[PDB]
Short mmCIF file of C-alpha atoms and ligand atoms in Angstrom, two decimals:
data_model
loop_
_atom_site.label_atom_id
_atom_site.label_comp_id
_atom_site.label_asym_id
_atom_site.label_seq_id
_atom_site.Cartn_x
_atom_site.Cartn_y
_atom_site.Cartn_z
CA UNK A 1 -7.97 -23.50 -10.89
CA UNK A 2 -10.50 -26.10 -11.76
CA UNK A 3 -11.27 -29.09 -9.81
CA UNK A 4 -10.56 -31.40 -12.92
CA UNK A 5 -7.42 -29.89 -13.72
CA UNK A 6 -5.90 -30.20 -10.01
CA UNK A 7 -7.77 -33.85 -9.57
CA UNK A 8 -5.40 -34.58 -12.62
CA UNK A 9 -1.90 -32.34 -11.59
CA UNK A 10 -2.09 -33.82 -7.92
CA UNK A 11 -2.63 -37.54 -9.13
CA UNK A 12 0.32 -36.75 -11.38
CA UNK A 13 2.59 -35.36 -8.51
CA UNK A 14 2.26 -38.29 -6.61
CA UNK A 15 2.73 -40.69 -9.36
CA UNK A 16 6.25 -38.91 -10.47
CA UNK A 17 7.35 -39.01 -6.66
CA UNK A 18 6.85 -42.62 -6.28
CA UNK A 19 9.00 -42.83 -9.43
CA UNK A 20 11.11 -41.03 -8.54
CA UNK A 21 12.04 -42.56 -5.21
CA UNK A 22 11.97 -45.31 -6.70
CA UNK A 23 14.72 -44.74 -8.97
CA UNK A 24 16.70 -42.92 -6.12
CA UNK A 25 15.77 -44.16 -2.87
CA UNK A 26 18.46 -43.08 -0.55
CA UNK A 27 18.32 -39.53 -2.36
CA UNK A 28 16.68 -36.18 -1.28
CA UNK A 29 13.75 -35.32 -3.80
CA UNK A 30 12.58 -31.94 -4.74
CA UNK A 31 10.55 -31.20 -8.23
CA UNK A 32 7.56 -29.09 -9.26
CA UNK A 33 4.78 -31.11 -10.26
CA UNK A 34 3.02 -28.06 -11.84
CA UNK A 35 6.03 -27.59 -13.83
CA UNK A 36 6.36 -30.70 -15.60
CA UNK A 37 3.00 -30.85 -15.90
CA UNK A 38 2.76 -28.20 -18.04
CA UNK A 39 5.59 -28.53 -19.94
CA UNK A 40 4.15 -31.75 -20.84
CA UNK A 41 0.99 -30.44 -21.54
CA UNK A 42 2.76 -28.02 -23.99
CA UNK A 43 4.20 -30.77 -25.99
CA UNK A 44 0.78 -32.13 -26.00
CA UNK A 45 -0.30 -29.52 -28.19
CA UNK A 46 1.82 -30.87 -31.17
CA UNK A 47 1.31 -34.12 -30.63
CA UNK A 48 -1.55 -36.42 -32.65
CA UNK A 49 -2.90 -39.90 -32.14
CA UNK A 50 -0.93 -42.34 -29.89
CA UNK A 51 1.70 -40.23 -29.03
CA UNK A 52 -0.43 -37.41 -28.16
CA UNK A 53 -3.46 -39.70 -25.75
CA UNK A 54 -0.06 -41.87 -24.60
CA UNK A 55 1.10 -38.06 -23.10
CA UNK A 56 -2.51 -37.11 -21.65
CA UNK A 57 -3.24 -40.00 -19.56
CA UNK A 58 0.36 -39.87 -18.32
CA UNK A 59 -0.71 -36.68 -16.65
CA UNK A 60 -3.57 -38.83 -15.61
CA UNK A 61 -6.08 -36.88 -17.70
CA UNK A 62 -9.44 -38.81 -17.96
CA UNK A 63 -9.97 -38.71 -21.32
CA UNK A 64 -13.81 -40.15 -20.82
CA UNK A 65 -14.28 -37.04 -19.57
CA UNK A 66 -12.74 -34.19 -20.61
CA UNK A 67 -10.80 -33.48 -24.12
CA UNK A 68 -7.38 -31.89 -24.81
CA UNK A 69 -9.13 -28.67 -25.92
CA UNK A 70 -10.10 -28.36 -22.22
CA UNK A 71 -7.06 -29.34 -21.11
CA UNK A 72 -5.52 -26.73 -22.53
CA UNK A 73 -7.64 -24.16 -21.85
CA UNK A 74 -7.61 -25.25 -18.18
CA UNK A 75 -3.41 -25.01 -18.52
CA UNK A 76 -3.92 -21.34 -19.98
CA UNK A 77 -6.26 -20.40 -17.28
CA UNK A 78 -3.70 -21.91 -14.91
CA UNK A 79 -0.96 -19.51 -16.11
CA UNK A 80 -2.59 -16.52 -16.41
CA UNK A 81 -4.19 -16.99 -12.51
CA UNK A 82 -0.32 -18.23 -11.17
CA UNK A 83 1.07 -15.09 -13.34
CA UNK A 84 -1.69 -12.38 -11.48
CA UNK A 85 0.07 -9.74 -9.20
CA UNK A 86 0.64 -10.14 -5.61
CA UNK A 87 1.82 -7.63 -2.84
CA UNK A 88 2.38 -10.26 -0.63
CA UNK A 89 4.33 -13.01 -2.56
CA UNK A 90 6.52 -13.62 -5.43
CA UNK A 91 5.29 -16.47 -7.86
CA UNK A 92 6.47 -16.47 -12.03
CA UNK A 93 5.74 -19.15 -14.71
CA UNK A 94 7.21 -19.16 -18.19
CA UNK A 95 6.74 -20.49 -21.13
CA UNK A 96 9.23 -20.72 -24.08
CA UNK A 97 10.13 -22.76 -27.05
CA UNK A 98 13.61 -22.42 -28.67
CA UNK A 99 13.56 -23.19 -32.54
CA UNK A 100 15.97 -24.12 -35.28
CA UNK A 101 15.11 -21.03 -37.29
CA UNK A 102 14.73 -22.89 -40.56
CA UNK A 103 12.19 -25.32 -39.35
CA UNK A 104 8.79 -24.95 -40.84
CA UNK A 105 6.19 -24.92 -37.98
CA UNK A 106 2.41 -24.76 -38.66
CA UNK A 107 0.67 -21.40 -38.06
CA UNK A 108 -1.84 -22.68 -35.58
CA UNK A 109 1.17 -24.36 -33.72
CA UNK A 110 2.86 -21.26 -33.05
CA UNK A 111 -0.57 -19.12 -32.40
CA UNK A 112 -1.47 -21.64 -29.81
CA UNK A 113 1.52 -22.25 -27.79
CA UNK A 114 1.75 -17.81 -27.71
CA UNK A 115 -2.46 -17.88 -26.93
CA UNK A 116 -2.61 -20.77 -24.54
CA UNK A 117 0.82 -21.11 -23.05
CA UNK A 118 1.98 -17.55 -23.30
CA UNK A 119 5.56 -18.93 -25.26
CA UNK A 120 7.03 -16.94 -27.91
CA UNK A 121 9.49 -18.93 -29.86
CA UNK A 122 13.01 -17.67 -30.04
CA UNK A 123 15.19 -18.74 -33.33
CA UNK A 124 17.81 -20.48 -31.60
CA UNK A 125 20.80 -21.73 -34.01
CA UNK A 126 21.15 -25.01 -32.33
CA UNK A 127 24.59 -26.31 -34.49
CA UNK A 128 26.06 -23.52 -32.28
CA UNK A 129 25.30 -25.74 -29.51
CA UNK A 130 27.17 -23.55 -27.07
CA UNK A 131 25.42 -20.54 -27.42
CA UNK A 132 22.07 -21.93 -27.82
CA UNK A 133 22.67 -24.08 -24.62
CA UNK A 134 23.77 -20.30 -22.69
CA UNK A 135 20.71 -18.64 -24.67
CA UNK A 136 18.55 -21.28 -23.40
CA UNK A 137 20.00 -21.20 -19.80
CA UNK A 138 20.06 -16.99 -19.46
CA UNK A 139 16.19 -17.67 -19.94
CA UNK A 140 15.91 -19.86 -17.13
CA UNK A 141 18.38 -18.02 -15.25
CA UNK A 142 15.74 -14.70 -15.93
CA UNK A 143 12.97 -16.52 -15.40
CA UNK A 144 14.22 -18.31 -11.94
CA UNK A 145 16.23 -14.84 -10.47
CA UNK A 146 19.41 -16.62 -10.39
CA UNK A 147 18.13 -20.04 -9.01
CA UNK A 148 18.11 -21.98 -11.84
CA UNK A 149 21.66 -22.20 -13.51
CA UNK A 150 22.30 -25.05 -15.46
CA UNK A 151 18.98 -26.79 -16.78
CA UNK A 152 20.49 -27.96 -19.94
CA UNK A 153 23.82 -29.31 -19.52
CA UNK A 154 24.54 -30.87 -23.39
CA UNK A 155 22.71 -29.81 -26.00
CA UNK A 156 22.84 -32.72 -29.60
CA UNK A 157 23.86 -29.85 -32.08
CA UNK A 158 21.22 -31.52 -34.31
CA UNK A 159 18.09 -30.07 -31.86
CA UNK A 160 15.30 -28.53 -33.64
CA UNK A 161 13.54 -27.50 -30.78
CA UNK A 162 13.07 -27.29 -27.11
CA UNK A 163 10.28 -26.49 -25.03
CA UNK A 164 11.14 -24.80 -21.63
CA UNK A 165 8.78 -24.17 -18.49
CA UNK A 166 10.18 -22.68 -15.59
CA UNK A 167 8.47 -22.10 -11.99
CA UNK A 168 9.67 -19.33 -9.40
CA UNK A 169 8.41 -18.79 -5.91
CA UNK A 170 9.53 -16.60 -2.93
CA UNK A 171 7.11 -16.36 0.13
CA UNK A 172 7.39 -15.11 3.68
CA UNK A 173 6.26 -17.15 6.54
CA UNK A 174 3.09 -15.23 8.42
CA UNK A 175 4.77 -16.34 11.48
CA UNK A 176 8.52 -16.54 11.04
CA UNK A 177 11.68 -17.83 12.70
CA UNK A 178 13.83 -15.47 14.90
CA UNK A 179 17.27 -16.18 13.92
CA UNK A 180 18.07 -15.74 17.28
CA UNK A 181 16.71 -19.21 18.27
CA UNK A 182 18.39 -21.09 15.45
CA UNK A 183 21.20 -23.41 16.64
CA UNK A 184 22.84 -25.91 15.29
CA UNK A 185 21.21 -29.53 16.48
CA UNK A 186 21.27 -32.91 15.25
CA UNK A 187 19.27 -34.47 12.10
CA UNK A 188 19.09 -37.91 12.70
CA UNK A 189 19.66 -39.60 9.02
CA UNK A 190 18.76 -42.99 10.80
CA UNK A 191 18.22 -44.14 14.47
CA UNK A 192 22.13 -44.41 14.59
CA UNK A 193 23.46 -41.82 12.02
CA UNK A 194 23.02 -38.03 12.34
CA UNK A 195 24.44 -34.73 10.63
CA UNK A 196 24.16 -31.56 12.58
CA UNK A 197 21.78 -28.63 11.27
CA UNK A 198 20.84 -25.54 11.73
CA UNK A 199 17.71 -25.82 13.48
CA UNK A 200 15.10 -23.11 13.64
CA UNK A 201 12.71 -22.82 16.37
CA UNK A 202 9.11 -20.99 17.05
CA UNK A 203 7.48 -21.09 20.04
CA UNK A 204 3.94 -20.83 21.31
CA UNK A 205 2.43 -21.51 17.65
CA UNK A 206 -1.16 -22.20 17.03
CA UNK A 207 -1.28 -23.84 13.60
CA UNK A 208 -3.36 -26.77 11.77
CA UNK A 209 -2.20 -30.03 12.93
CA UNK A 210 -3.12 -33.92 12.33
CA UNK A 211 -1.61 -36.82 14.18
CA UNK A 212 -2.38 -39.24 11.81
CA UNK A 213 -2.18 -42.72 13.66
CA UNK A 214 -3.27 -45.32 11.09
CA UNK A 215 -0.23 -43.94 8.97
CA UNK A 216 1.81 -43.02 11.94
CA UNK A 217 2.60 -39.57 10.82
CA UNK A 218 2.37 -36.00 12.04
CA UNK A 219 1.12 -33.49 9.65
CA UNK A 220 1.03 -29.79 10.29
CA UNK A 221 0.06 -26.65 7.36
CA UNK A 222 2.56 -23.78 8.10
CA UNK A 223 1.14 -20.62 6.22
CA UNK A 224 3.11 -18.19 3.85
CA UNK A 225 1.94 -14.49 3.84
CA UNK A 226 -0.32 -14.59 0.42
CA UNK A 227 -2.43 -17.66 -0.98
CA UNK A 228 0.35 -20.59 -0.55
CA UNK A 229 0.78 -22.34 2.34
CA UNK A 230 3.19 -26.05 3.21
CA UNK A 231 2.33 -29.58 4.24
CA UNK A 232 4.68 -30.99 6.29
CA UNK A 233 4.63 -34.66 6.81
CA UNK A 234 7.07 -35.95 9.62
CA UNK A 235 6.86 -39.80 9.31
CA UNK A 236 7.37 -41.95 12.89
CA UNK A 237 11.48 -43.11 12.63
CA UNK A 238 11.95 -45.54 9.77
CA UNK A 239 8.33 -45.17 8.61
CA UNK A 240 9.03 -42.75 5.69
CA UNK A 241 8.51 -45.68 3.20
CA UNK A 242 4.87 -46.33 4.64
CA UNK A 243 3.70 -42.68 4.68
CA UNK A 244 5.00 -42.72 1.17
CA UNK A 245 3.56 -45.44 -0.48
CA UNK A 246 0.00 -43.98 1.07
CA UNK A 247 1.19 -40.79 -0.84
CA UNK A 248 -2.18 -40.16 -3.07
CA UNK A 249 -4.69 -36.92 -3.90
CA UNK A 250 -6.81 -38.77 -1.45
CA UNK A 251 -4.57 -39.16 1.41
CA UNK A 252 -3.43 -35.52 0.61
CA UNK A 253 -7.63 -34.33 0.78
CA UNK A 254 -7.99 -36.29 3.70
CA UNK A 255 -4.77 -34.76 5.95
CA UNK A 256 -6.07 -31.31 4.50
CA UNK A 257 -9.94 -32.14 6.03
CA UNK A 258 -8.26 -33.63 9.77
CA UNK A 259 -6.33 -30.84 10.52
CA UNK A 260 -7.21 -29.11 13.94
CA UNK A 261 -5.62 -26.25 15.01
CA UNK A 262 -3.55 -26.89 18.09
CA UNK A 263 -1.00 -24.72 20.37
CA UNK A 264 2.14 -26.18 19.85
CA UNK A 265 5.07 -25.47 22.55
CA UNK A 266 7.72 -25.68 19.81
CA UNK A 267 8.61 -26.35 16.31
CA UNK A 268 11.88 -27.06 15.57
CA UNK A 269 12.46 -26.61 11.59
CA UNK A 270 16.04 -27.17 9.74
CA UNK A 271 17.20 -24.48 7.67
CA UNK A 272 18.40 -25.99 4.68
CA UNK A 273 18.90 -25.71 0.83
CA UNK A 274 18.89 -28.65 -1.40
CA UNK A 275 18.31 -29.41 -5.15
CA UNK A 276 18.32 -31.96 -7.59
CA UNK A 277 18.88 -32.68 -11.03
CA UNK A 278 16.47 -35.03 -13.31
CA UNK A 279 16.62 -36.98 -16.51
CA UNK A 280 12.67 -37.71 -16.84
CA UNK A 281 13.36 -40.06 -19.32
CA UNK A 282 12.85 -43.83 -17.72
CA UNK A 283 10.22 -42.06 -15.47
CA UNK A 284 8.16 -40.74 -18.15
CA UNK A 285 8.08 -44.13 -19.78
CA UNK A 286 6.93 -45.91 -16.61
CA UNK A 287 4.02 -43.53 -16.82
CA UNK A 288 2.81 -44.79 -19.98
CA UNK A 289 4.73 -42.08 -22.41
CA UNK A 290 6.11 -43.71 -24.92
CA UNK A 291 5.77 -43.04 -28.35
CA UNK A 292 6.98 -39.57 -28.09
CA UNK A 293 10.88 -40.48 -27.47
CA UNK A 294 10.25 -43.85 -30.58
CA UNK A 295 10.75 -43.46 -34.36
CA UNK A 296 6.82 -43.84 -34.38
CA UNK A 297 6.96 -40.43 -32.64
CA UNK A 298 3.62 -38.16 -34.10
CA UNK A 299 4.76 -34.55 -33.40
CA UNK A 300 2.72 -33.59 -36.91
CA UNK A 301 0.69 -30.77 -34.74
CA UNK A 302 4.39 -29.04 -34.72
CA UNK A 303 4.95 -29.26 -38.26
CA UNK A 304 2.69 -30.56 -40.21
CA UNK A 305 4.72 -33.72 -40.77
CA UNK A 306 5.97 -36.55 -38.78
CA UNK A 307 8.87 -35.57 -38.63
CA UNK A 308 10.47 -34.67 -34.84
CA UNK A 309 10.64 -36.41 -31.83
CA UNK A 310 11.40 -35.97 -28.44
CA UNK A 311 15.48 -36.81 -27.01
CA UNK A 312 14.48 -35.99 -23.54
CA UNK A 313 13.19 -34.50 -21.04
CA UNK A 314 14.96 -32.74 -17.88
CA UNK A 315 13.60 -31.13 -14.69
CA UNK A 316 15.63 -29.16 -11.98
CA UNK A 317 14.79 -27.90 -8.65
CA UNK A 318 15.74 -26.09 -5.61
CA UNK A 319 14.03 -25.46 -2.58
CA UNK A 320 15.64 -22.72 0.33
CA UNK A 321 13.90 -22.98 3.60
CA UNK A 322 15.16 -20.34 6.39
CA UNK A 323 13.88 -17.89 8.94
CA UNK A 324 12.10 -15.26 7.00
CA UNK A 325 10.71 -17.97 4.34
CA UNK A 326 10.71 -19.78 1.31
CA UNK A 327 12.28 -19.57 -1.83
CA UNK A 328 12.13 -22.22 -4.06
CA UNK A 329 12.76 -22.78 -8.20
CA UNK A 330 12.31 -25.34 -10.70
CA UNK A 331 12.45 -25.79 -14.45
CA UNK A 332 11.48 -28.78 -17.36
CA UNK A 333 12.99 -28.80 -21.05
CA UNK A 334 11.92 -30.75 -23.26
CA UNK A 335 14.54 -31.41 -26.51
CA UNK A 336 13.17 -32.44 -29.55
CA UNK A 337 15.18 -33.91 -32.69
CA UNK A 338 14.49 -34.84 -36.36
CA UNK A 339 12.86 -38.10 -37.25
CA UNK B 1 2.61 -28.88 25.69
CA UNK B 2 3.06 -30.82 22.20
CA UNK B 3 6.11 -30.24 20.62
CA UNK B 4 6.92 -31.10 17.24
CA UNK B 5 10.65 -31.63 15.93
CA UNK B 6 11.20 -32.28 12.27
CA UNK B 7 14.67 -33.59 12.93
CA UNK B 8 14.45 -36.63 10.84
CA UNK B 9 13.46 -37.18 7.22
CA UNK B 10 10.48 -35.49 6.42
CA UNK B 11 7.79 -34.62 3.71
CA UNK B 12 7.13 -30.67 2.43
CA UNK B 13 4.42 -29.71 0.07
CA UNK B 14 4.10 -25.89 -0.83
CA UNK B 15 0.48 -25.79 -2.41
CA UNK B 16 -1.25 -22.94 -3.89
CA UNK B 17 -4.85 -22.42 -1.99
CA UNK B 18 -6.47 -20.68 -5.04
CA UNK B 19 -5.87 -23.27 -7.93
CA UNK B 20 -4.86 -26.38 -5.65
CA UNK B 21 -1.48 -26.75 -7.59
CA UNK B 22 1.01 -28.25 -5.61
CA UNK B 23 3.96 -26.03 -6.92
CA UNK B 24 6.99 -27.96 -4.84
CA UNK B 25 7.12 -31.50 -3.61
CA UNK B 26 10.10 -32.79 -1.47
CA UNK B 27 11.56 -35.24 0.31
CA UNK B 28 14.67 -34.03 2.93
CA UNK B 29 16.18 -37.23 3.74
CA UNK B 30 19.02 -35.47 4.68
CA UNK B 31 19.41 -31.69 4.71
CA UNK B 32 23.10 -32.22 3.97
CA UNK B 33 22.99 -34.12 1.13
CA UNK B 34 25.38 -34.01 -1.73
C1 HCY C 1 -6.29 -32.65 -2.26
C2 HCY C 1 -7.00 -31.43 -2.97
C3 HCY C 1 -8.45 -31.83 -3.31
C4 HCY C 1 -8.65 -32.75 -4.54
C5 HCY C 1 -7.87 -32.19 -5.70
O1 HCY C 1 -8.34 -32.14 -6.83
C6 HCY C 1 -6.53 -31.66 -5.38
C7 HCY C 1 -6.21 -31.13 -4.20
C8 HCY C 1 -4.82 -30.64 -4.00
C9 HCY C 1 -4.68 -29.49 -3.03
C10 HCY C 1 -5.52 -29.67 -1.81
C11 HCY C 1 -6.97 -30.10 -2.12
C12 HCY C 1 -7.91 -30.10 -0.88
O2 HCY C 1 -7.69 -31.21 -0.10
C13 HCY C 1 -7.78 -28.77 -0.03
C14 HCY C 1 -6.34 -28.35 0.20
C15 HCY C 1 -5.65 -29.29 1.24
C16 HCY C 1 -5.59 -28.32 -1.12
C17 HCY C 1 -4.23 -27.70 -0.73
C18 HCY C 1 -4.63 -26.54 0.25
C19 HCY C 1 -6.08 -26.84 0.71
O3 HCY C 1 -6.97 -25.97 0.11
C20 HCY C 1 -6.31 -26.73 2.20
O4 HCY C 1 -5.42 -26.86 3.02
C21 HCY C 1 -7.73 -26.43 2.66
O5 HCY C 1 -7.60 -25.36 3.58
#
């Protein structure tokens, strides 16, 4: 809710989707920052000295000027304003960490992960590697209504623990699509190449809009009934790469502050469903985080000891646009090992 | 009258007004992907 805290989370979400495309370029992407920045920050908690400021900056934290004790009071107030109720949409964040039940975790661990990130900690008898894996995928499943299946997909039976965010939203447009005008048109992949679509339509719209000339872009905010609301950036043909590498929490501040409203004649909107699958592991290390996966791993704030690291880290998300609204789903695990 | 046709790969960012979180980024290069 803070301005430090978003300054931070939106600098992040940009940074992991230039990674990310990056790695994939040719690929659809769809994450929640939010999410894997707080299951990050969660690890943080247990985490001391290199391994722990190597994991704050990577969230791109200034550590001149705040301190993880804010930063994790700013995640707890996060969680408890994303958690409020709401009559007009659905939005759920969880926290949870899965345990080997004989590890020995300190006190203050354990009270601060339930006080600030609202996890319990579930004994989880990870040599059964198949029923911890389902345990651990029923929560998400919960947690997600369905969306979220298959988060973890092999579990080492020598985990000790696994930290698990997960991130579900379901919103109705304020002005929605009449299924009646959907039909199925082209999406043009490239200037030569298209698949066809379902393509929604509204009509007579007055929404925020942004021609944005210098990037040559069109940006417009479509609302959701409740406090969320969408940027959508439609790039010129074959300029997605320049609108992305402009992708920044000042580019993002700046569309938000040149939006006009305008009447538009139509909108034409695919309906669609798509959802990926990530191993955050090379990503996480090009953004600095590094001593957390090494045998100089310092987890001691779990423990006492140094003696756990982290295997990896996974994200998956899916995003269903149609007439009525939104629905979209996402999830992080983190798997920690001996050392 | 402007019209505006998102039939080609395009950006979506659902963002949360009260605690500026961006909850969902995505790219849909193709809405048919694999
Ligand atoms: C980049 C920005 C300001 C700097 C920051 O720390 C992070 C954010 C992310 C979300 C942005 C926000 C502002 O620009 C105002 C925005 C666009 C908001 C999303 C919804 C918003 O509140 C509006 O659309 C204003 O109506």
């Amino acid at each position: 809710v803070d301005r430090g805290l978003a300054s931070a989370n939106v600098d992040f979400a940009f940074s992991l989707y230039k990674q990310l495309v990056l790695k994939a370029p040719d690929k659809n992407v769809i994450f929640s920052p939010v999410s894997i920045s707080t299951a990050l920050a969660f690890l943080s908690l247990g985490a001391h000295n290199t391994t722990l400021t190597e994991i704050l900056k990577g969230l791109k934290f200034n550590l001149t000027e705040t301190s993880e004790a804010e930063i994790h009071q700013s995640f707890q107030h996060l969680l408890r304003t994303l958690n409020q109720s709401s009559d007009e949409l659905q939005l759920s964040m969880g926290n949870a960490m899965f345990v080997k039940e004989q590890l020995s975790l300190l006190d203050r661990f354990t009270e601060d992960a339930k006080r600030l990130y609202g996890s319990e900690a579930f004994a989880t008898d990870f040599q059964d590697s198949a029923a911890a894996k389902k345990l651990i995928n029923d929560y998400v499943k919960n947690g997600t209504r369905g969306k979220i299946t298959d988060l973890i997909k092999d579990l080492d039976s020598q985990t000790m623990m696994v930290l698990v965010n997960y991130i579900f939203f379901k919103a109705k447009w304020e002005m929605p699509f009449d299924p009646q005008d959907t039909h199925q048109s082209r999406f043009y992949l490239s200037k030569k190449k298209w698949v066809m679509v379902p393509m929604m339509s509204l009509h007579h719209l007055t929404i925020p809009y942004f021609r944005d000339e210098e990037l040559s872009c069109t940006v417009v905010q479509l609302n959701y009934t409740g406090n969320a609301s969408v940027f959508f950036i439609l790039p010129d043909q074959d300029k997605m790469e320049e609108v992305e590498a402009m992708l920044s929490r000042e580019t993002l501040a700046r569309w938000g502050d040149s939006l006009e409203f305008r009447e538009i004649g139509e909108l034409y909107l695919p309906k669609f469903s798509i959802s990926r699958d990530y191993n955050l592991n090379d990503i996480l290390l090009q953004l600095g985080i590094e001593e957390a996966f090494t045998s100089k791993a310092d987890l001691s704030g779990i423990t006492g000891a140094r003696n756990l690291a982290v295997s990896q880290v996974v994200h998956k998300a899916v995003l269903d646009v149609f007439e009525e609204g939104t629905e979209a789903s996402a999830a992080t695990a983190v798997k920690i090992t001996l050392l | 009258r402007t019209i505006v046709r998102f039939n080609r790969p395009f950006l979506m960012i659902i963002v949360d007004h009260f605690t500026w979180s961006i909850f969902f980024m995505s790219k849909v290069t193709n809405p048919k992907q694999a």
